[PDB]
Amino acid sequence: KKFVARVEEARAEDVGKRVVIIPKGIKVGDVVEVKKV
Amino acid sequence: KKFVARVEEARAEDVGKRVVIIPKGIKVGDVVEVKKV
């Protein structure tokens, strides 16, 4: 269960969605691979 | 450049943060591995 996506900035319409908060070192625009463990 | 974290619900204080929006299939509470590609 894995996917690829780009980090993005949270906006008012994102409130209520499921997210992983991204830390410093990884910026908006970066591509990340997310895999459920 | 990788980390492990739990999916969480976006709230009003998360507006402005960097996030990956998580799709259906992965829920709040799930542990995921995030790796910059």
Author numbering:
A (entry chain A), B (entry chain A): 6 to 42
Question: How does the study describe this entry?
Answer:
Here, we study fold transition between distinct β-barrels by protein engineering and structural biology technique. Here, we discover that the previously reconstructed ancient DPBB sequence could also adopt a β-barrel fold named Double-Zeta β-barrel (DZBB), as a metamorphic protein. Furthermore, the reconstructed OB fold could also be converted to the four-stranded SH3 fold by a simple circular permutation. Thus, these ancient β-barrel folds (DPBB, RIFT, OB, and SH3) could be readily interconverted by a few feasible mutations through the missing-link fold, DZBB, indicating their significantly close evolutionary relationships.
To test this assumption, we conducted the reverse engineering by replacing segment 1 of design-13 and design-16 with the 8-amino acid sequence forming the Z-loop of design-2 (the 3rd generation mutants: design-18 (tkoL2_v1.2_Z) and design-19 (mkaL2_v1.2_Z)). SEC and CD experiments demonstrated that both mutants folded and had moderate thermal stabilities. The crystal structures of design-18 and design-19 revealed that they adopt the DZBB fold even without the α1 region (segment 2). These results demonstrated that the segment 1 is sufficient to archive the fold-change from DZBB to OB. Most DNA molecules did not migrate from the well when mixed with the proteins with the stable DZBB fold (design-2, -18, and -19) and RIFT fold (design-3 and -4), indicating that these proteins formed large aggregates with dsDNA. In particular, design-2, -18, -19, -3, and -4 interacted with dsDNA even in high salt conditions (500 mM NaCl). Design-2, -18, -19, -3, and -4 might interact with the phosphate groups in the DNA backbone in a similar way to the sulfate ions in the crystal structures of DZBB.
